[PDB]
Amino acid sequence: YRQTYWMPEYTPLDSDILACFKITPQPGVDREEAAAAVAAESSTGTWTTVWTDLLTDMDYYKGRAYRIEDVPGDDAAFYAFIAYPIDLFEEGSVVNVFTSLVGNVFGFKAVRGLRLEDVRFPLAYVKTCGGPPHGIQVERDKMNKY
Amino acid sequence: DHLHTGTVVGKLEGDRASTLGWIDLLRESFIPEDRSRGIFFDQDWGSMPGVFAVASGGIHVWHMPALVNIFGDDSVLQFGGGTLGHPWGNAAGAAANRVALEACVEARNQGRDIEKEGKEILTAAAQHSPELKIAMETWK
Amino acid sequence: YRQTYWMPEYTPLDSDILACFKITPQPGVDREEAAAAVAAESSTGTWTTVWTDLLTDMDYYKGRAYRIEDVPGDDAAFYAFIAYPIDLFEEGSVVNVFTSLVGNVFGFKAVRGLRLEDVRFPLAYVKTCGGPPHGIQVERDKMNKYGRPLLGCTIKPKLGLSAKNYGRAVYECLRGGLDFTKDDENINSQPFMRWRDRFLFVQDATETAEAQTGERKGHYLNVTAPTPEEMYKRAEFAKEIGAPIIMHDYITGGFTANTGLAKWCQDNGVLLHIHRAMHAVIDRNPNHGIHFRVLTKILRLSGGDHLHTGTVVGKLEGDRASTLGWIDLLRESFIPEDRSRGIFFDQDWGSMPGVFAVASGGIHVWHMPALVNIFGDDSVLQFGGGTLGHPWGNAAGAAANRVALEACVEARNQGRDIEKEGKEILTAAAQHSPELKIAMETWK
Amino acid sequence: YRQTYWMPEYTPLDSDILACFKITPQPGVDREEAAAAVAAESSTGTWTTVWTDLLTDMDYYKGRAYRIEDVPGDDAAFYAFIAYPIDLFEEGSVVNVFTSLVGNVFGFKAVRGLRLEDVRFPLAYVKTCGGPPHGIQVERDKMNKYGRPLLGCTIKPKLGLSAKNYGRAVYECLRGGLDFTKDDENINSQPFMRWRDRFLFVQDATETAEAQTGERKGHYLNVTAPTPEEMYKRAEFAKEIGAPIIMHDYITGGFTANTGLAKWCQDNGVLLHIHRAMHAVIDRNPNHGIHFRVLTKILRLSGGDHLHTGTVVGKLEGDRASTLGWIDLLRESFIPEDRSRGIFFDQDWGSMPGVFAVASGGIHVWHMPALVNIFGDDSVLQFGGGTLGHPWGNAAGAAANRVALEACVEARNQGRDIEKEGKEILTAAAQHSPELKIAMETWK
Amino acid sequence: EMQDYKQSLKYETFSYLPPMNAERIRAQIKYAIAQGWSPGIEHVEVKNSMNQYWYMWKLPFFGEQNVDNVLAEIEACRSAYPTHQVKLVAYDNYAQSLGLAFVVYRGN
Amino acid sequence: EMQDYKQSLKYETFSYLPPMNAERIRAQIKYAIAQGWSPGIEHVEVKNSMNQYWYMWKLPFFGEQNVDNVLAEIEACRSAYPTHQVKLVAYDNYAQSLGLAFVVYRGN
């Protein structure tokens, strides 16, 4: 499980979707193991390689944990940083990104608690979504309020 | 029409009541109050049809007699790993799962304790199903 | 003019749109001045600061020239590199980017000639455009064709054939062995042959050929129309009758119309063949115009499954690098900078699917080993003359071309130098194909 | 190749489409051969007779070169006159005619350069196209403006203005005295300024200026869009908010899209301003390209109420004839052949209404008497810098331009030589207009 | 002197060439392996040859370097289904397509 | 060691098991009766087995407690239609569905 979905050396691309998870693991389980577990269950969901896995580019289509940090003031939790390729998600679908990130990882039984702290939306994925219909300045111009 | 409810077998024997209670909430027309199963209110559904129960996640041919005994006929059993991880392929894994399902259903219909005799029933079925036999060999 | 719109120190952002202009300036004018002139006229268009200028962030909303390079072999021209913020353009509008880049700068009077050589599309702007409706791999999956280049043919003459006669040329061409036939860029709906009758008879011929051969068949039905309503009606009729592929003229028809048709094709699952008519009025002059590599980038941004790129063999051995470079631009996911091949910028395409390369014009069975070696499997080879000029007919010519293609592909797969052994391979294939043998005899 | 597609004896029919090509051939090749080559590649594209050729009337369905003339002052080029039957083209498709004429001939390798100088549209083909939606006289009737050229202005900078700030430039420009303001060819919908907010604030400013002045006002709202659906949506929104005129880029947007938008404008009673962006990549080179007179014919066939034609004063006195000739092509009902002005064919327009001439680029109050004398009343004069650069503001600049225009028009009506007496007329007008006086002081 | 073309059902790539022998099939398998593709075996009824989805013979040979083993598997497929068409494919995982595909036996 | 899966037409519930004999059919009938369901017998042509509606053999055995009688009726249906597939059903009136359904004879 370990060597496959967590790469300490991996440098995340500017188009990669980055997610930070506060993992409160069960005592005794490995921090890197739990980080790879969140990365896998949020990207592929399994470790057992099946014959259909070999039909795809496994090195590309997977989420990888690249950094683990201590939580200040909480020795029972650690921060897991995971990088996701932009190719893993529908363009302009907050629904799809949200589902891919939080579909099953929060039901993981080897951690006592899981919190999604921050998510990095790259400018490439940002440019696809419509965003706010008007925005602050356009709304101010329309309402004539300054 | 379908809804994921959990595999039930994935919890310990003493922590299955709430899952069974919400299974009854999903499927049955009238669920009496049951504090042990977590049903706090009498819930009358009238004529609204039930919803199929879906069990999925880390379940294979060995859990199957327990799955049949717990869920009954009105359920959907999902085998992602238990079908794709078959050494002979997806078709062979699906055939193994189907043969196991039919054998367990017939054993339940005959009045046998399928959970107590699950290994014997599955072995007897595998005497006629090489795909099923190799499936148990893989997932033992 | 100088200090305001050209910054030697500026480092371009990964989201910036970069453009390379070959400037042939009037003698005596400053190179940096001309670079700033292209940058300004392509971004703001003026130097005199007006009171409305002070209401905006002038430091941001402007194009800047950041590098000037000498042109190898041409002392009278220099290369100007200009960076454009992504904010200057409508998201997903090749029309808007193209207009902003080439609206007025080519009319500049202080330069003798201006050529747009390369344009860098950042991945952020790339992710917004729809791109090719299907792509090479999806088209291959749909057509159930693998391991060899596709074969096409242009039905000739361009004039005179009724619907039924055009269909009875298409039918023999397809039943002979070609995967596709091609409507000409002139044929959309003429008095001698109306478009609906074209579509009906072409679909009949394609279905008959598919039934009699056992291979998926298609015809690039031209939907280029005077109005977008007419174009959409023709495409919808093609889908209704079941035509798997249509054709559009993306330059004469227009970039807006091509983008709309590509979006419709992606929505409706219809393959799109793109013809590059008029491209020569733009990309031929070495000192004034916009390069066909830029046109190829624009086309693949807009959307299309096929694109004419040239026959490559039609040029000398020392003039093939630019064609190969824009071939890589059209087909590959990431094309590193290559000055020898004319690739001035690193071009990252991400997940956008490639576009089939179409080679057409004066090519026959003899050019074929070279065509295979140069283009690879992901290309479409068109044989108008090489199929219609066959003495035994369209079916025999198509059979000859198909046999030659299969023989060359197998020879390449066996590890042979197909270009060095082309004559031997073709003769060995002709020992089992009289149609192929007489084809080489005709076109020797 | 020779005897087949060029007939010296052929007399062209009144319904034939005639095209004049300036051929700069490779040295040593035959003039008649090159003429037949352009004729063939623009009509049929091949010389090798195939079996499908014999199924058609080859004598009819072909373009023929009937006359070769020397180019005055250029011994390396000659003029090729080619006749095309009206049957070769879709009725009412400038796209199809343009494609048939310029699809492949410009890529001919046996000529060093090819220019399409003039094209004769017969009245039979002219009667099929919709033409300008309204025309000069109908637009004048709708806007209630007579006896003087119209005044326009391009809102600058091209970048940075929010919707409200752009509207507060347009409002002062219109309330100052200009009949129209102009959206830039770059502005359709950018992140800093969305198109709907543009349309709303522009309509508010136009209505306010019209109410405060007492004259009909307008703004060429740009509807050039990545997709025809988006373009039609923007035009429909402009009509819904009540905008009397919109603008399209007919070259970058596309001829099909422009024809569709022109038909929609004719249907919905919305005036159409046409911008000629990119025209320089095509019409600038003297030896390779398609002439702006041909582009003007194509545009007026497609449909449009205004068209940029150049400032005329921007060229020397000895280089104005071609501009005047295409001005006459755009505006007049029948333009006789004139080799001095570059009119190679008699062009009969019948009842198709003329298109307003737009002069824009580096022109101010001083050029104005010359502009009036050259263009006449049926023209639109655009003052971007000459209005926005006014030290007292947009309103003062517009007032200066309007006062100068009215003074020049009255001077012309009185029988004075306005070009000879321009300074005196402008000074006499400035004796009653401080804004005009300071305008000449600024731009002297 | 001209010869009439004889029409017959065709089967895509390499179908216009004489049927491949053991040497040619081995060369094709070696090419597919050298390209990094995974060989695969499929079979269907002759009337059902057109289907996009063929009966899969065993599993694609991932990481297989034995051309003789691939040929032996092809012959085993033929023996198990004598009346079925036999096709050889090569999966390109990077492009998610097939780098090579041709029929070994044309059915009967 | 790897052998191919042999494809054949499959007939829903209990079709992946060896054909049931008299004892197994009697056990199924006893289960259906003990569940309170009404046994029923249907038959159809083999090519028409997929149809939602089969030929109905007499009437559903409402309140029937004789497993031997139901089996004898199944055999009588087989005798009357030797070439037809034979199915046994169990009507669940409360759920308006079938609690059990499987084919006794597989057609020929």
Side-chain angles (χ1 to χ4, degrees), chain A, chain B, chain C, chain D, chain E residues 1-107, chain F residues 1-107:
Chain A
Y1 208 70
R2 184 181 281 213
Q3 293 177 335
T4 323
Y5 305 65
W6 94 269
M7 325 168 110
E9 178 67 278
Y10 193 100
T11 296
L13 307 178
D14 290 335
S15 54
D16 284 344
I17 279 78
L18 316 177
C20 172
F21 286 93
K22 164 187 294 195
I23 299 179
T24 303
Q26 297 282 353
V29 79
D30 185 81
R31 285 184 161 191
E32 309 162 350
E33 177 79 11
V38 173
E41 287 226 77
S42 94
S43 56
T44 69
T46 178
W47 58 286
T48 68
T49 297
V50 292
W51 76 272
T52 47
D53 271 309
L54 298 171
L55 309 162
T56 71
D57 189 2
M58 281 285 328
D59 290 335
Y60 184 11
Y61 294 103
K62 68 182 178 168
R64 60 223 65 203
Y66 64 109
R67 169 138 53 71
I68 278 144
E69 290 175 14
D70 273 12
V71 171
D74 192 0
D75 293 347
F78 69 96
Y79 274 140
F81 283 48
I82 312 183
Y84 303 92
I86 198 163
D87 255 28
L88 304 199
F89 316 102
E90 165 91 350
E91 30 176 294
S93 174
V94 300
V95 170
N96 175 276
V97 176
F98 197 57
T99 301
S100 310
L101 292 165
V102 314
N104 300 321
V105 291
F106 288 79
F108 214 39
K109 285 165 166 159
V111 317
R112 283 176 165 174
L114 185 65
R115 205 215 179 109
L116 180 55
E117 289 266 42
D118 229 318
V119 49
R120 202 281 295 279
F121 278 67
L123 187 65
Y125 195 81
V126 167
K127 204 53 62 163
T128 300
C129 294
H134 283 46
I136 287 158
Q137 293 79 32
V138 152
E139 195 198 6
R140 283 190 170 283
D141 286 341
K142 281 191 156 292
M143 288 314 209
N144 165 23
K145 295 180 196 281
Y146 308 98
Chain B
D1 288 301
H2 299 188
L3 172 64
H4 290 234
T5 71
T7 56
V8 184
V9 300
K11 325 268 270 173
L12 289 155
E13 196 212 297
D15 311 289
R16 264 171 51 260
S18 98
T19 305
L20 266 183
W22 74 55
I23 279 280
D24 255 0
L25 287 192
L26 188 67
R27 272 223 308 293
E28 203 201 8
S29 157
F30 179 79
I31 300 92
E33 182 178 351
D34 187 315
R35 303 313 189 85
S36 70
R37 282 153 87 94
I39 308 304
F40 284 30
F41 290 136
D42 294 307
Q43 183 58 63
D44 192 5
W45 291 120
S47 95
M48 201 155 307
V51 179
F52 258 92
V54 152
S56 177
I59 57 151
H60 45 66
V61 284
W62 290 138
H63 304 98
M64 203 85 107
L67 288 166
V68 168
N69 186 45
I70 293 180
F71 280 88
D73 291 341
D74 262 41
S75 65
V76 186
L77 310 180
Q78 301 264 336
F79 292 135
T83 295
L84 305 183
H86 195 282
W88 291 358
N90 296 356
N97 288 133
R98 182 65 177 278
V99 168
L101 176 70
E102 291 192 350
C104 288
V105 167
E106 190 177 10
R108 177 175 44 83
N109 293 358
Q110 291 168 344
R112 287 198 232 190
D113 193 336
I114 62 177
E115 203 151 345
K116 199 168 179 169
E117 296 211 341
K119 193 141 203 285
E120 303 100 286
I121 292 154
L122 291 173
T123 300
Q127 299 321 298
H128 310 287
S129 202
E131 294 81 24
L132 174 61
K133 193 176 180 162
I134 208 64
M136 300 97 68
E137 289 188 10
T138 301
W139 282 291
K140 185 162 175 217
Chain C
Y1 208 70
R2 184 181 281 213
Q3 293 177 335
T4 323
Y5 305 65
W6 94 269
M7 325 168 110
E9 178 67 278
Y10 193 100
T11 296
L13 307 178
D14 290 335
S15 54
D16 284 344
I17 279 78
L18 316 177
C20 172
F21 286 93
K22 164 187 294 195
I23 299 179
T24 303
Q26 297 282 353
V29 79
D30 185 81
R31 285 184 161 191
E32 309 162 350
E33 177 79 11
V38 173
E41 287 226 77
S42 94
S43 56
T44 69
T46 178
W47 58 286
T48 68
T49 297
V50 292
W51 76 272
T52 47
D53 271 309
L54 298 171
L55 309 162
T56 71
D57 189 2
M58 281 285 328
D59 290 335
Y60 184 11
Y61 294 103
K62 68 182 178 168
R64 60 223 65 203
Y66 64 109
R67 169 138 53 71
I68 278 144
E69 290 175 14
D70 273 12
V71 171
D74 192 0
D75 293 347
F78 69 96
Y79 274 140
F81 284 48
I82 312 183
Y84 303 92
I86 198 163
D87 255 28
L88 304 199
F89 316 102
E90 165 91 350
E91 31 176 294
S93 174
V94 300
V95 170
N96 175 276
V97 176
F98 197 57
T99 301
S100 310
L101 292 165
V102 314
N104 300 321
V105 291
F106 288 79
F108 214 39
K109 285 165 166 159
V111 317
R112 283 176 165 174
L114 185 65
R115 205 215 179 109
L116 180 55
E117 289 266 42
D118 229 318
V119 49
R120 202 281 295 279
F121 278 67
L123 187 65
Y125 195 81
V126 167
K127 204 53 62 163
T128 300
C129 294
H134 283 46
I136 287 158
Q137 293 79 32
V138 152
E139 195 198 6
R140 283 190 170 283
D141 286 341
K142 281 191 156 292
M143 288 314 209
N144 165 23
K145 295 180 196 281
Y146 308 98
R148 64 169 179 89
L150 307 185
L151 282 181
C153 166
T154 39
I155 307 299
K156 311 165 94 200
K158 279 197 31 177
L159 329 167
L161 288 171
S162 71
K164 189 156 180 171
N165 288 336
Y166 197 94
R168 95 154 52 215
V170 163
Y171 161 62
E172 324 287 3
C173 289
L174 290 177
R175 90 181 181 94
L178 303 132
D179 307 295
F180 298 112
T181 43
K182 173 160 176 305
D183 272 351
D184 195 84
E185 47 275 42
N186 194 326
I187 311 276
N188 51 297
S189 165
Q190 267 101 329
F192 70 87
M193 162 155 188
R194 293 272 156 66
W195 71 267
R196 206 172 181 285
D197 306 315
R198 199 180 50 231
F199 281 32
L200 261 173
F201 277 99
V202 155
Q203 187 63 22
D204 196 320
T206 281
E207 272 189 347
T208 306
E210 180 164 310
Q212 289 170 359
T213 288
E215 299 180 350
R216 293 296 315 280
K217 294 320 208 273
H219 192 49
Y220 322 132
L221 285 166
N222 186 6
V223 298
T224 281
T227 59
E229 210 167 344
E230 199 88 0
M231 158 211 288
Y232 274 140
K233 187 172 47 145
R234 290 171 195 191
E236 202 145 30
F237 187 68
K239 175 213 170 52
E240 173 193 340
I241 71 182
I245 187 155
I246 62 177
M247 159 185 90
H248 188 249
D249 293 318
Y250 83 114
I251 300 169
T252 58
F255 288 132
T256 288
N258 192 71
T259 285
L261 181 63
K263 178 179 78 161
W264 180 93
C265 283
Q266 183 203 350
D267 194 340
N268 271 264
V270 175
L271 308 167
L272 183 54
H273 179 93
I274 298 297
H275 191 281
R276 58 173 191 164
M278 140 172 297
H279 77 90
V281 305
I282 296 167
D283 63 12
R284 184 172 174 178
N285 192 285
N287 304 313
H288 190 82
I290 166 155
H291 205 285
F292 186 66
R293 74 177 65 94
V294 173
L295 295 179
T296 291
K297 286 194 187 188
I298 290 159
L299 192 172
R300 164 181 201 200
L301 263 295
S302 211
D305 288 301
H306 299 188
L307 172 64
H308 290 234
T309 71
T311 56
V312 184
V313 300
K315 325 268 270 173
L316 289 155
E317 196 212 297
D319 311 289
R320 264 171 51 260
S322 98
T323 305
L324 266 183
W326 74 55
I327 279 280
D328 255 0
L329 287 192
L330 188 67
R331 272 223 308 293
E332 203 201 8
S333 157
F334 178 79
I335 300 92
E337 182 178 351
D338 187 315
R339 303 313 189 85
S340 70
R341 282 153 87 94
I343 308 304
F344 284 30
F345 290 136
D346 294 307
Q347 183 58 63
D348 192 5
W349 291 120
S351 95
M352 201 155 307
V355 179
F356 258 92
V358 152
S360 177
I363 57 151
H364 45 66
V365 284
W366 290 138
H367 304 98
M368 203 85 107
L371 288 166
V372 168
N373 186 45
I374 293 180
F375 280 88
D377 291 341
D378 262 41
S379 65
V380 186
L381 310 180
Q382 301 264 336
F383 292 135
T387 295
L388 305 183
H390 195 282
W392 291 358
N394 296 356
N401 288 133
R402 182 65 177 278
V403 168
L405 176 70
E406 291 192 350
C408 288
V409 167
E410 190 177 10
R412 177 175 44 82
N413 293 358
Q414 291 168 344
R416 287 198 232 190
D417 193 336
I418 62 177
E419 203 151 345
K420 199 168 179 169
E421 296 211 341
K423 193 141 203 285
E424 303 101 286
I425 292 154
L426 291 173
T427 300
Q431 299 321 298
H432 310 287
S433 202
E435 294 81 24
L436 174 61
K437 193 176 180 162
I438 208 64
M440 300 97 68
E441 289 189 10
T442 301
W443 282 291
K444 185 162 175 217
Chain D
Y1 208 70
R2 184 181 281 213
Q3 293 177 335
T4 323
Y5 305 65
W6 94 269
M7 325 168 110
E9 178 67 278
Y10 193 100
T11 296
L13 307 178
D14 290 335
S15 54
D16 284 344
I17 279 78
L18 316 177
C20 172
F21 286 93
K22 164 187 294 195
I23 299 179
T24 303
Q26 297 282 353
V29 79
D30 185 81
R31 285 184 161 191
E32 309 162 350
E33 177 79 11
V38 172
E41 287 226 77
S42 94
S43 56
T44 69
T46 178
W47 58 286
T48 68
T49 297
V50 292
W51 76 272
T52 47
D53 271 309
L54 298 171
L55 309 162
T56 71
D57 189 2
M58 281 285 328
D59 290 335
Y60 184 11
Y61 294 103
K62 68 182 178 168
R64 60 223 65 203
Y66 64 109
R67 169 138 53 71
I68 278 144
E69 290 175 14
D70 273 12
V71 171
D74 192 0
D75 293 347
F78 69 96
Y79 274 140
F81 283 48
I82 312 183
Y84 303 92
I86 198 163
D87 255 28
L88 304 199
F89 316 102
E90 165 91 350
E91 31 176 294
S93 174
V94 300
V95 170
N96 175 276
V97 176
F98 197 57
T99 301
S100 310
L101 292 165
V102 314
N104 300 321
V105 291
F106 288 79
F108 214 39
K109 284 165 166 159
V111 317
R112 283 176 165 174
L114 185 65
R115 205 215 179 109
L116 180 55
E117 289 266 42
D118 229 318
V119 49
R120 202 281 295 279
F121 278 67
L123 187 65
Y125 195 81
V126 167
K127 204 53 62 163
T128 300
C129 294
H134 283 46
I136 287 158
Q137 293 79 32
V138 152
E139 195 198 6
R140 283 190 170 283
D141 286 341
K142 281 191 156 292
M143 288 314 209
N144 165 23
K145 295 180 196 281
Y146 308 98
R148 64 169 179 89
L150 307 185
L151 282 181
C153 166
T154 39
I155 307 299
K156 311 165 94 200
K158 279 197 31 177
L159 329 167
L161 288 172
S162 71
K164 189 156 180 171
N165 288 336
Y166 197 94
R168 95 154 52 215
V170 163
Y171 161 62
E172 324 287 3
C173 289
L174 290 177
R175 90 181 181 94
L178 303 132
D179 307 295
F180 298 112
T181 43
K182 173 160 176 305
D183 272 351
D184 195 84
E185 47 275 42
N186 194 326
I187 312 276
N188 51 297
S189 165
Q190 267 101 329
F192 70 86
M193 162 155 188
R194 293 273 156 66
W195 71 267
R196 206 172 181 285
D197 306 315
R198 199 180 50 231
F199 281 32
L200 261 173
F201 277 99
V202 155
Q203 187 62 22
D204 196 320
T206 281
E207 272 189 347
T208 306
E210 180 164 310
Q212 289 170 359
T213 288
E215 299 180 350
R216 293 295 315 280
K217 294 320 208 273
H219 192 49
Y220 322 132
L221 285 166
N222 186 6
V223 298
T224 281
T227 59
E229 210 167 344
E230 199 88 0
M231 158 211 288
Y232 274 140
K233 187 172 47 145
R234 290 171 195 191
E236 202 145 30
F237 187 68
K239 175 213 170 52
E240 173 193 340
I241 71 182
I245 187 155
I246 62 177
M247 159 185 90
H248 189 249
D249 293 318
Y250 83 114
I251 300 169
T252 58
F255 288 132
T256 288
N258 192 71
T259 285
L261 181 63
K263 178 179 78 161
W264 180 93
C265 283
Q266 183 203 350
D267 194 340
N268 271 264
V270 175
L271 308 167
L272 183 54
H273 179 93
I274 298 297
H275 191 281
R276 58 173 191 164
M278 140 172 297
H279 77 89
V281 305
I282 296 167
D283 63 11
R284 184 172 174 177
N285 192 285
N287 304 313
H288 190 82
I290 165 155
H291 205 285
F292 186 66
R293 74 177 65 94
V294 173
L295 295 179
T296 291
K297 286 194 187 188
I298 290 159
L299 192 172
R300 164 181 201 200
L301 263 295
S302 211
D305 288 301
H306 299 188
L307 172 64
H308 290 234
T309 71
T311 56
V312 184
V313 300
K315 325 268 270 173
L316 289 155
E317 196 212 297
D319 311 289
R320 264 171 51 260
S322 98
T323 305
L324 266 183
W326 74 55
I327 279 280
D328 255 0
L329 287 192
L330 188 67
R331 272 223 308 293
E332 203 201 8
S333 157
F334 178 79
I335 300 92
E337 182 178 351
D338 187 315
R339 303 313 189 85
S340 70
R341 282 153 87 94
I343 308 304
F344 284 30
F345 290 136
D346 294 307
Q347 183 58 63
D348 192 5
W349 291 120
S351 95
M352 201 155 307
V355 179
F356 258 92
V358 153
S360 177
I363 57 151
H364 45 66
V365 284
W366 290 138
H367 304 98
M368 203 85 107
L371 288 166
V372 168
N373 186 45
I374 292 180
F375 280 88
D377 291 341
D378 262 41
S379 65
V380 186
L381 310 180
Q382 301 264 336
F383 292 135
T387 295
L388 305 183
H390 195 282
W392 291 358
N394 296 356
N401 288 134
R402 182 65 177 278
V403 168
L405 176 70
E406 291 192 350
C408 288
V409 167
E410 190 177 10
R412 177 175 44 83
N413 293 358
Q414 291 168 344
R416 287 198 232 190
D417 193 336
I418 62 177
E419 203 151 345
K420 199 168 179 169
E421 296 211 341
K423 193 141 203 285
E424 303 100 286
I425 292 154
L426 291 173
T427 300
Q431 299 321 298
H432 310 287
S433 202
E435 294 81 24
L436 174 61
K437 193 176 180 162
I438 208 64
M440 300 97 68
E441 289 188 10
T442 301
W443 282 291
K444 185 162 175 217
Chain E
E1 55 142 7
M2 81 175 98
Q3 304 263 49
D4 182 57
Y5 185 68
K6 303 308 181 205
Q7 190 71 36
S8 277
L9 285 178
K10 283 332 181 193
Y11 322 88
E12 282 294 338
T13 303
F14 301 145
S15 68
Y16 282 75
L17 308 174
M20 281 135 288
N21 53 5
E23 183 169 53
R24 276 170 92 159
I25 295 162
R26 281 199 291 264
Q28 294 304 310
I29 300 162
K30 182 178 169 170
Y31 163 71
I33 291 174
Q35 294 298 310
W37 305 332
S38 299
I41 288 329
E42 333 196 310
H43 64 86
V44 203
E45 324 80 334
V46 53
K47 70 179 192 202
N48 195 306
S49 80
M50 172 46 98
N51 256 14
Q52 291 274 9
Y53 279 108
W54 298 46
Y55 297 108
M56 181 95 98
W57 170 277
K58 294 192 200 253
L59 199 84
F61 306 110
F62 303 108
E64 175 67 89
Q65 303 292 301
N66 206 295
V67 152
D68 299 325
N69 182 53
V70 185
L71 181 58
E73 288 287 352
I74 289 169
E75 307 296 336
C77 178
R78 184 155 183 173
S79 282
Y81 300 95
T83 65
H84 282 197
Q85 263 194 10
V86 180
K87 193 209 310 175
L88 175 67
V89 302
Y91 286 90
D92 202 300
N93 64 328
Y94 293 0
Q96 289 285 349
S97 147
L98 304 175
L100 191 83
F102 67 95
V103 279
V104 157
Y105 175 48
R106 264 181 190 101
Chain F
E1 62 208 337
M2 183 50 281
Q3 73 264 53
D4 184 61
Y5 187 73
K6 303 307 182 203
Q7 190 70 36
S8 279
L9 286 179
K10 289 314 184 32
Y11 319 144
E12 277 293 329
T13 303
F14 301 145
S15 67
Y16 284 84
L17 308 175
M20 282 135 288
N21 55 8
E23 182 171 53
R24 274 181 101 160
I25 296 162
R26 282 199 290 264
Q28 294 304 309
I29 301 159
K30 182 178 169 170
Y31 162 72
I33 291 174
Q35 294 299 310
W37 303 329
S38 299
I41 300 70
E42 334 194 309
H43 63 86
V44 284
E45 321 85 349
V46 46
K47 69 181 191 202
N48 176 358
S49 89
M50 161 65 98
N51 254 15
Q52 286 275 8
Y53 284 91
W54 295 23
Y55 297 107
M56 171 95 88
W57 177 255
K58 305 195 191 255
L59 192 83
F61 306 113
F62 295 137
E64 175 67 89
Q65 303 292 300
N66 206 296
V67 152
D68 299 325
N69 181 54
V70 156
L71 180 58
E73 217 71 1
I74 289 169
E75 288 158 351
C77 178
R78 182 155 182 173
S79 282
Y81 298 93
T83 64
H84 282 197
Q85 263 194 10
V86 180
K87 192 206 308 175
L88 176 67
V89 301
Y91 287 90
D92 188 356
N93 63 328
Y94 293 180
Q96 279 301 293
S97 147
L98 304 176
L100 191 83
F102 67 96
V103 279
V104 168
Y105 176 49
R106 294 221 160 151

